Amino acid sequence: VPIPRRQLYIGGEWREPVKKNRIPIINPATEEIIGDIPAATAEDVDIAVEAARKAIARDDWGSTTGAQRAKYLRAIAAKVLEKKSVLATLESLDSGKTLYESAADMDDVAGCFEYYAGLAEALDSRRMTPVNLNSDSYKSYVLREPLGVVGLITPWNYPLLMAIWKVAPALAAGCAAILKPSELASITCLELGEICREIGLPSGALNILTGLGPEAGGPLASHPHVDKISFTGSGPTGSKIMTAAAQLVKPVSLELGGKSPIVVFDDIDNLDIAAEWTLFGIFANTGQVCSATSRLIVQENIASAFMDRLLKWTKNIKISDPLEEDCKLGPVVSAGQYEKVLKFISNAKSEGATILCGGERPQHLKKGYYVQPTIITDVNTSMEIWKEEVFGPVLCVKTFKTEEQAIELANDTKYGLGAAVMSKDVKRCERFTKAFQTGIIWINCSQPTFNELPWGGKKRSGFGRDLGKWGLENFLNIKQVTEYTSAEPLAFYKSP
Amino acid sequence: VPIPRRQLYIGGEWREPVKKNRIPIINPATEEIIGDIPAATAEDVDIAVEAARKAIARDDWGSTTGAQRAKYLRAIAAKVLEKKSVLATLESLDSGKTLYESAADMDDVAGCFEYYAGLAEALDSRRMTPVNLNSDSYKSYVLREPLGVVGLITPWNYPLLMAIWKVAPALAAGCAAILKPSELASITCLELGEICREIGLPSGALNILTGLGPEAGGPLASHPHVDKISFTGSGPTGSKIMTAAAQLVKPVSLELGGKSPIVVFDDIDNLDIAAEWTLFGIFANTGQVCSATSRLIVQENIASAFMDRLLKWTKNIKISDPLEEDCKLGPVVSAGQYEKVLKFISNAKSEGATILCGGERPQHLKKGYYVQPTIITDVNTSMEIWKEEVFGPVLCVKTFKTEEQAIELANDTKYGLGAAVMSKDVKRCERFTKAFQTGIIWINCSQPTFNELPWGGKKRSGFGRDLGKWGLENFLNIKQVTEYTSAEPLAFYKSP
Ligand code: NA
Ligand code: NA
Questions:
Q1: How far apart are alpha carbons A152 and A205 in whole angstroms?
Q2: Cα separations in angstroms, B424 against A483, B4, B265, B433, B446
Q3: I want to staple A348 with a disulfide (CB 3.0 to 4.6 A). Which of A9, A385, B21, B169 is the partner?
């Protein structure tokens, strides 16, 4: 430890919530209350929006160059790397994420800030774009400027990282942001506020409001002076936010869950390498990954041998305290999530499916929301386990003979986030790239991504793209500037 | 004039609606029923979505190249131009649009199809974009593909043109589109269906469902198999569509109304040139223009001189049946609109504003929804006339002394679509380009636009951009494709 105790971060200052409420920090490994966070309400949202509006109107932020904002982004990145070990420890204590994964997230945070710092440095030369028109009387160009005040509502699965995926491009674009992290994992996001204080980030450029979704997130979505909402989390929450934004014809982006498939063909070169990618696609982060490859679709010729290697690798996953450097599986984030995940596993048993491994809590761990990595077989398409996102370390399996059957099973979901194809056959991998009904496709792996690439899905996984140039462009207002250069009258109407 | 009688256009066929309902076509100039149109319901929507999905799955649409789609787009453009006189007369009879304006819309339809045919040819070369990663174990690229099934809900003010702004980029991107034109002006959109049949457009590529908003448009927004909604029309309908789309976390774009300002400075070179641009920005299309410059903000030194020129040009506008030569003003589209527009004028009088000219139906025209071009003065910012979009030939006027007052008045709106500045001062025009809280800025003109330019607004005018590359990109699904090229194991987990 120690566990920080912070207030809300608004207009460059620490501010107590108007209603003075607090909500707890629970360590999911021990189930112990380890501290508390401020619980913001609509009165705090109003203050945060006024502070963000003040930033856009001030020279300190609203009139900065992209080069100037890039300096702030880099200074935040350097303070994150300086505090790396402390922040990774807090990330694990708060979320249950392993220390190794928490440390990888911190490096991804630095990399995300650096990527956007570079784009902010290129931004100003692309501010004004002359446009070719088939006319000599008109002169036109496209002007790109910050969109304004943006609300960023983020999830607990990558507490600081998911916040940065939104924060880094919003600040790079010149927007003033109001970040609303999950009430289940707010420590590192509140530490971002302290970092912004340390680097002298201009007042209102970033405002951090912790609290319950309906009380703190909800008012952002219905606020008259929030220009856009960027959301990552559950589909039912996304629908609520979009419904509230519709009343003010306010744009929103939604990065929602998935039921991503991993398709394993009989021509894979190495069974252990493919089995390891399968474990990674489903058990990493205790399966609390939107893009997790939760449905294994395996070719019948290798199914038996591949399942053997998969089960052997799975039973070798070290489940322990997340702070242990060699921990491979932490607990799920909360009691609510623990109950939800165990209910999915029990419903699968009651529907006729087979628990090939896991499905229980580990024997040596009496406390903590620990769920064993679970492999579910003898699964049919009508089962809840096949259709619904579990958000736990739970993999379900179906076999196939033909490529056509694999595509049909792969696309047999209402979601459309990611998908993976494991095969040595280059033309087959290209066919799957086109056929998978998703926003992300992995070939001979599952999960890796880079800042340079667009991230997002389709169907019930939502819309909009995070990262790459898309992340920044989501935060720009586009203007058409059209000038009449001819000295002649329009000559549409009759002169009096 | 012969009025065509058509059925719904679905899966390459003329199809009767399931419930066999039809609704009248009213000529706004005569108030007479001149024919009828099919009235689609939810069962017709279901058939159109299935036809659209079949097109996506068929090699002759879903597997076409951009060059192949470009050939259909150009064939549609050629057919529109061959039938220009017929289509332009039909557009006037249906909507009340002057024949001269209807003819200009047909030139723009052909031009829009031509611009998108060009973009479709370039699309194949940008289908796969390799992305440089600073990695030795991964290779990634961006894949752009059609978004899928798209619902396009369009308004009556530019019946065919507004349909084409959505249809041309949807077909260029390779989507299968379902067009839902306004029940107030559907003749030309049904004629578009006949043109698609004549040119051999593949079945399901474009489906045209005429009918009432809640009956035919509604099920499109709530359909499980519609990937996106593109809407142009009123803010309240936009809100209802986005609300329905939210339950299925379906993306939408909303192009809504505005209360756009025209700012006139005392350094204008010619009073008559600026006065004609002002008439054009408010009276053309009977003021039924989303981007109309409905608020005149005039510098106090030139106000009296400018208003006198404005009155003289205004009183010179020929109001008559829209098919007549030299008609400069047609009627409003419907009885509902007529009453709404006259109600706004009577409310301004009740608020203490002055009706400088017009404000009534013209004396010489006993039939038709004719409203005289109206100029409203002695307006204050609290008045309904200043705040609300009238969507009629109604200009309201305020004076200013300083640039600071002009900017405050210009941005004193909940809307943010377009804005115009009339001044010879180059640096001032540059300051307004930045200062106007809009998506469109005109310099020394009001209304001109080109296909190469992004069109849309911010604030209550909505979000998303039509036209240019934006129009096309709105209809593409973006895919990240990440491949692991290394023969090495991931080495995250412990081998058994
Ligand atoms: Na926590
Ligand atoms: Na009509």
A1: 13
A2: 12, 50, 8, 14, 15
A3: A385
Q: Does A2 sit behind a cis peptide bond, omega within 30 degrees of 0 on the bond before it?
A: yes
Q: Which of residues 31-50 of A touch B (CB under 8 A)?
A: none
For residue B382, the one-letter residue type is S
Asked if residue B244 lies in contact with residue A230, where contact means CB atoms within 8 angstroms, the answer is no
Catalytic choice (B255, B276, B384, B396): B255
CA distance B488 to chain A (A): 8
* Count of residues in chain B: 496
**CA A152 to chain CA mean position, Å:** 11
Distance CA A326, CA A317 (A): 10
Q: Counting every residue, how long is chain A?
A: 496
Q: Do A441 and B470 touch (CB under 8 A)?
A: no
Separation CA A294–CA A396 (nearest Å): 6
Cα–Cα dist A491/B228, whole Å? 41
CATH number of B258-450: 3.40.309.10
CA of A20 to the centre of ligand 1 (A): 20
| Cα separation, A157 vs A447, whole angstroms | 15
- Residue B290 designated active-site: yes
Which is nearest to B362 in space by CA: B372, B353, B352?
Answer: B372
Q: Give the span between the Cα atoms of B107 and B121, in whole angstroms.
A: 21
The residue of chain A with its CA nearest to that of B445 is A484
B8 vs B17: CA distance, rounded Å: 7
Distance CA(A315)–CA(A329), nearest Å, equals 11
Q: Which of B478, B216, B220, B152 is nearest to A462 (CA)?
A: B478
**Distance, CA of A414 to CA of A459 (rounded, Å):** 6
Domain residue ranges of chain B, discontinuous segments joined by +: 1-257+451-496, 258-450
Enter the tokens of residue B309.
């020129």
**Cα(A254) to centroid(ligand 2), Å:** 38
Q: Which two tokens stand for residue A260?
A: 């991503």
Sheet containing strand A13-15, edge to edge, reads A13-15, A8-10, A206-208, A176-180, A149-153, A228-232, A252-255, A462-463
Compute the distance between CA of residue B328 and CA of residue B97 in angstroms, rounded to an integer: 10
Distance CA B51, CA B256 (A): 29
For the CA of A25, the nearest ligand? 1
The DSSP secondary structure of B315-377, one letter per residue, reads HT--BS-TTSTT--B---S-HHHHHHHHHHHHHHHHTT-EEEE--S--TT--SS-----EEEE
The burial of B346, by beta-carbon neighbours within 10 Å (0-12 exposed, 13-18 middle, 19 or more buried), is given as: exposed
* CA B249 – CA B247 distance, rounded (Å): 6
Question: What class does CATH assign to A1-257+451-496?
Answer: alpha beta
The residue type of B403 is: E
For residues A298 and A279, give the distance between their C-alpha atoms in angstroms, rounded to a whole number: 14
Q: Between the CA atoms of B210, B216, B218 and B219, what dihedral angle is there, to the nearest 10 degrees?
A: -130
Both tokens of B409, joined, read: 């008045």
Task: Please report the resolution in angstroms.
Answer: 1.9
Residue A376 belongs to what H/E stretch? strand A374-377
Contact A202, A12 (CB under 8 A): yes
